[PDB]
Amino acid sequence: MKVAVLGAAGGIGQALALLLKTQLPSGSELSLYDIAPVTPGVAVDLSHIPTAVKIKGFSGEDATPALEGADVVLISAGLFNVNAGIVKNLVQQVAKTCPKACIGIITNPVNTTVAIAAEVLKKAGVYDKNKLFGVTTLDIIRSNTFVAELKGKQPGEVEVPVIGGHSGVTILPLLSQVPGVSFTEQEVADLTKRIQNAGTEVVEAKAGGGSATLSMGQAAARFGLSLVRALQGEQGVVECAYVEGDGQYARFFSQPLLLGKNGVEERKSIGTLSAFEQNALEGMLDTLKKDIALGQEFVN
Ligand SMILES: [Ag+]
């Protein structure tokens, strides 16, 4: 089982690679790619950690040697103006070298870059909707932290389902479905708005000198490890991710997914929604649809 990290020299990629090197199952392989010439040294650095995970790093313009035999590709390289071209270039190389891998797009804006990725893989004739994921786990683990903080629970024991998209008002935490926890509607409103704007807390506290790299690395690592477990035959693995489903709300939509050996095994129902959640769901479908079309038209 091989995991390739495209964008491994950035802050997100390095934290992701550090977590994968120490937590991937024994016998796994990790390949790091980025443009920067330091990337081979990041792998050598990590290769000194005594886990049964083989790691190698590659630099330059060609990601092929890092992608050969890859089962999972995580793309954290790279707002729309800059990352759209980066995503298309890397997904094109994925479509030529490991077209059957599961692809997790971390590069933002996820709502749009997943649509770009889908259309690029379509042009190569290898697009598989069961294998393309927008990684939205950062909204989930932030929700877990904020809910446990407000309710005095252990943060490890709180799991909040989060649906919709990965930006602004498209992020919908289903607080009504957190077992053993009840909220007032003012708690729901303030908690939902904090989750939807959590990124701004980081950049403001960084004096504008950066963004959320370590927690995003942890989020991507959680989704990546869940994927690897499911691909290796583990049962009951459920994660929310931004995928092309039945299009009931939008072409791409984040929802609980049962993962399997093929990627998506079943797209689970979002369940019963509260009045607040149903309102917030229908009230953001248009801005989500425009995010998708922005990505489609860039390729088409
Ligand atoms: Ag796969």
From Swiss-Prot:
GO terms for molecular function: L-malate dehydrogenase (NAD+) activity; malate dehydrogenase activity; oxidoreductase activity; protein homodimerization activity. It catalyses: (S)-malate + NAD(+) = oxaloacetate + NADH + H(+). Changing residue 221 to T: In strain: ECO R37. It holds the Pfam family Ldh_1_N. GO terms for cellular component: cytoplasm; cytosol; extrinsic component of membrane; membrane. Gene3D superfamilies: Lactate dehydrogenase/glycoside hydrolase, family 4, C-terminal (3.90.110.10), NAD(P)-binding Rossmann-like Domain (3.40.50.720). NAD(+) binds at residues 7-13, 34, 83, 106-108, 216. One of its GO terms (biological process) is glycolytic process. Changing residue 95 to S: In strain: ECOR 27 and RT082. Changing residue 286 to N: In strain: E830587. Substrate binds at residues 108, 142. Keywords: NAD, Oxidoreductase, Tricarboxylic acid cycle. PROSITE patterns: MDH. InterPro entries: L-lactate/malate_DH (IPR001557), Lactate/malate_DH_C (IPR022383), Lactate/malate_DH_N (IPR001236), Lactate_DH/Glyco_Ohase_4_C (IPR015955), Malate_DH_AS (IPR001252), Malate_DH_type1 (IPR010097), Malate_DH_type1_bac (IPR023958), NAD(P)-bd_dom_sf (IPR036291). It is an enzyme of class 1 (oxidoreductase). The active site is at 166 (proton acceptor). Its EC number is 1.1.1.37. HAMAP family: Malate_dehydrog_1. Catalyzes the reversible oxidation of malate to oxaloacetate. Homodimer. Belongs to the LDH/MDH superfamily. MDH type 1 family. This is Malate dehydrogenase. The lineage of its organism: Bacteria, Pseudomonadati, Pseudomonadota, Gammaproteobacteria, Enterobacterales.
